[PDB]
Write a protein that binds this ligand. Structure first.
Ligand SMILES: Nc1nc2c(ncn2[C@@H]2O[C@H](COP(=O)(O)OP(=O)(O)NP(=O)(O)O)[C@@H](O)[C@H]2O)c(=O)[nH]1
Ligand SMILES: [Mg+2]
Ligand SMILES: [Mg+2]
Length: 159
């Protein structure tokens, strides 16, 4: 079983825990319980590779993580602004510009959007990483988000 150490980062309340619990448990957490630091391990098959995912759900690990899910909420402009701070801190710690990352715009089921998809696409394009729009509430593209991050790490290891 190939291991992938994934770390979910982003401002408070953007749905990091909700996305992680949807992946692990197939259950939407409606209550907002602020996270300290939670670890999960899940065995999955991704593109035919049997994988062990080690997911660290952080509070709103930069050394141990191999790939980072950088989450903002599409109805929280400040959380989108704060992404740069998360990425720059990761880059500093890993002393690298190619660390595997996926940009996640969560809560896409909410109509009170203030981060336009074009803004998010331009940021992702700049960093050289994928962009996935999710909803933990409806479980839209939750697996896609985490599996895309796995694939980024896989491609990184193979150059
Ligand atoms: N409508 C909607 N609400 C969501 C979605 N994802 C999370 N939420 C809601 O937003 C709140 C915060 O979700 P939660 O996962 O704790 O946030 P978090 O980033 O883990 N926060 P923290 O940093 O404090 O640990 C919860 O009420 C949750 O139900 C989503 O896709 N859609
Ligand atoms: Mg949390
Ligand atoms: Mg605007």
């Amino acid at each position: 079983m190939t291991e992938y150490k994934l770390v979910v980062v982003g401002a408070g309340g953007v749905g990091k825990s909700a996305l992680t619990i949807q992946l692990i448990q197939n259950h939407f957490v409606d209550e907002y319980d602020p996270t300290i630091e939670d670890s999960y391990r899940k065995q999955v098959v991704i593109d035919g590779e049997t994988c062990l995912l080690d997911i660290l759900d952080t509070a709103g690990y930069m050394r141990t993580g191999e790939g980072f899910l950088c989450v903002f909420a599409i109805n929280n402009t400040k959380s989108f602004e704060d992404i740069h701070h998360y990425r720059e801190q990761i880059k500093r710690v890993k002393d690298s510009e190619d660390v595997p990352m996926v940009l996640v715009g969560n809560k896409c089921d909410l109509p009170s959007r203030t981060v336009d998809t074009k803004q998010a696409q331009d940021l992702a394009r700049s960093y050289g990483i994928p962009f996935i729009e999710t909803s933990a509430k409806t479980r839209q593209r939750v697996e896609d988000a985490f599996y895309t991050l796995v694939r980024e790490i896989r491609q990184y290891r193979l150059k």
